[PDB]
């Protein structure tokens, strides 16, 4: 075969591969200053030459701290051509969280600025990975050895994620039986690296020879900087939360841009209802970009199944996430005796070549949260099949609580709030109002453009659930707090209240 994803095994053969093939090629672009792949290739070969001297070492976990630029760039890709995997420091994190992760991975060197107190001390600037530049420039990694290792919460200890070079290989594999990419292509790199949805970033790019373009730090605070930036550099595929999607809707439609350059917004993280993407729809139509809903987690390598956008999608109230890559198999399990029948809520079971080894040393936790029955991995989410064999997600499974004589699942309540045509986001938490005296609540927001009161949403709840299911209070909010690592922080809601 010709094809650089099938024949490679490891991403560093994939990208000195695709580099070497047409070195000439941009890789990377900052503003104007344009990266080849050739450049890339032997600035990354240089920088991994540091790496060596500082011990870095095949197994090796090396923290990564540095914002998403062409030197964090070449950073990883030094750190993965030593043999080593990544381990993305967000640079919002706490500090207790930092200390954690840096212990928890027992990371043994760090690339870019250290956070203050960091226990690392064995360091690589980021000025020392820019000096590294222009310069000339082992077995390399294997299939089964680390990439990266990212942590995620959740309430707990932050639980690391090791991803092998083999995962990951496998979503490149399985993303051209969704997605037509090319290497004329343009990606945005967007996300922080320590969320996994910027290794699709990357490697989506790189796997296919396309140009990787960073966002400047002065575009970064809104979308209508954004916009300008994707716009004024031929940017073809970018990837959104459905929250950031809504402010780029906006300020595209009241600023007046030309969006048509876009092939492809793809969505993660996030339940996407139709009332987020009717504006879009209107304004845009649904071919130029496509869109295209993706679920996925970081247990499993950043996507499981994706669904494009159709107007059937836009005439129905819930939120469909499709089918899942071709790498997995699939169950919906009850609590039970395990398989639902068809059309029924239950768990969501993964399995495949795109399922992570585990969590870095938790034992009691992977046992459980990776069974074997075929090796899977239970994700917490409650799906449902379709007639046709694409999955509606749900909500969360840890979302039952108890309450004044019921059991109640709160992600139910959600998803019926969810179904009205003027709410992009909503969340049901319990809260005290006379004392001895709990009640639901529902925290949501409304659709730009639109003012719902209290009085209509109960009106349109009661129509969905029974009594004891309904909120007792609805608050309005511009938008639900966020963790960094959010998402919709659940906790921070209750406090609003
Ligand atoms: N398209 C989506 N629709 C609904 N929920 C999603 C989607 N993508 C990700 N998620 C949620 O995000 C979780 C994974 O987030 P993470 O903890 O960062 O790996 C999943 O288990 C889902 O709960
Ligand atoms: C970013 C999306 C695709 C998913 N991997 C997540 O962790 O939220």
């Known amino acids: 075969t010709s094809d650089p994803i099938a ?17 000439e090629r941009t890789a990377l672009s900052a503003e104007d200053d344009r990266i080849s792949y050739g450049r890339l290739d032997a600035w990354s070969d240089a920088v991994a030459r540091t790496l060596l001297a500082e011990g870095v070492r095949p197994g090796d976990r090396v923290a990564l701290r540095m914002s998403p630029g062409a030197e964090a760039i070449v950073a990883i890709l030094a750190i993965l051509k ?64 680390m990439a990266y290792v990212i ?11 090791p991803v092998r070079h083999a995962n990951v290989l496998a979503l490149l594999a399985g993303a051209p039986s969704v997605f037509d990419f090319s290497g004329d292509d343009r990606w945005l790199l ?16 790189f796997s296919t020879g396309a140009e990787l373009v960073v966002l400047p730090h002065w575009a970064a605070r809104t979308p209508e900087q954004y916009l300008a930036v ?37 969505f993660g993280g996030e339940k996407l209802t139709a009332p987020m993407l009717r504006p879009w729809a209107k304004a845009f139509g649904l071919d130029r970009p496509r869109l295209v809903n993706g679920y996925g987690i970081t247990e499993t390598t950043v996507f499981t199944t994706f669904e494009e956008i159709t107007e059937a999608y836009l005439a129905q109230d819930a939120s469909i996430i499709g089918r899942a890559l071709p790498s997995f198999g699939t169950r919906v399990v009850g609590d039970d005796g395990r398989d639902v029948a068809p059309g029924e809520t239950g768990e969501l079971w993964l399995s495949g070549a795109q399922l992570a080894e585990g969590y870095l040393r938790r034992p009691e936790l992977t046992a459980e949260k990776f069974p074997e029955v075929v090796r899977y991995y239970r994700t917490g989410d409650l799906v449902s099949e379709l007639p046709d064999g694409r999955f509606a997600y749900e909500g969360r499974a840890d979302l039952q609580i108890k309450l004044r004589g019921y059991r109640i699942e709160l ?18 938490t319990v809260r005290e109002f006379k004392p001895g005296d709990l009640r639901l609540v529902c925290a949501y927001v409304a659709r730009e453009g639109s003012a719902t009161t209290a009085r209509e949403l109960r009106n349109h709840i009661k129509t969905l659930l029974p009594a004891y299911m309904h909120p007792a209070r609805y608050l309005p909010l511009p938008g639900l707090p966020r963790t960094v690592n959010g998402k919709v922080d659940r906790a921070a809601v209750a406090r609003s209240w």
């Open 230 to 266: 994707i716009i004024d550099r031929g940017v073809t595929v970018i990837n959104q939360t459905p929250t950031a999607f809504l402010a780029l809707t906006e300020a595209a439609v009241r600023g007046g841009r030309d969006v048509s350059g876009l092939r492809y917004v793809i």
């Open 151 to 161: 942590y995620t919460s959740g309430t707990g200890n932050p639980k690391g994620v």
């Open 82 to 145: 030593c043999g080593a995997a990544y381990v993305p420091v967000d640079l919002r994190n706490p500090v207790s969280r930092s200390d954690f992760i840096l212990a928890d991975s027992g990371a043994s060197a760090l690339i870019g600025e250290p956070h203050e107190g960091c226990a690392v001390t064995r360091v690589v600037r980021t000025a020392a990975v820019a000096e590294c530049k222009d310069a000339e420039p082992a077995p390399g990694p294997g299939a089964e050895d």
């Open 190 to 205: 967007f996300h922080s690296l320590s969320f996994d949805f910027s290794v699709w970033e990357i490697w989506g790019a």
């Open 7 to 23: 024949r490679n095994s490891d991403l560093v053969s994939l990208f000195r591969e695709v580099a070497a093939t047409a070195p």
């Open 411 to 428: 992600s139910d309540i959600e998803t019926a709030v969810r179904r009205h045509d003027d709410v992009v986001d909503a969340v049901v």
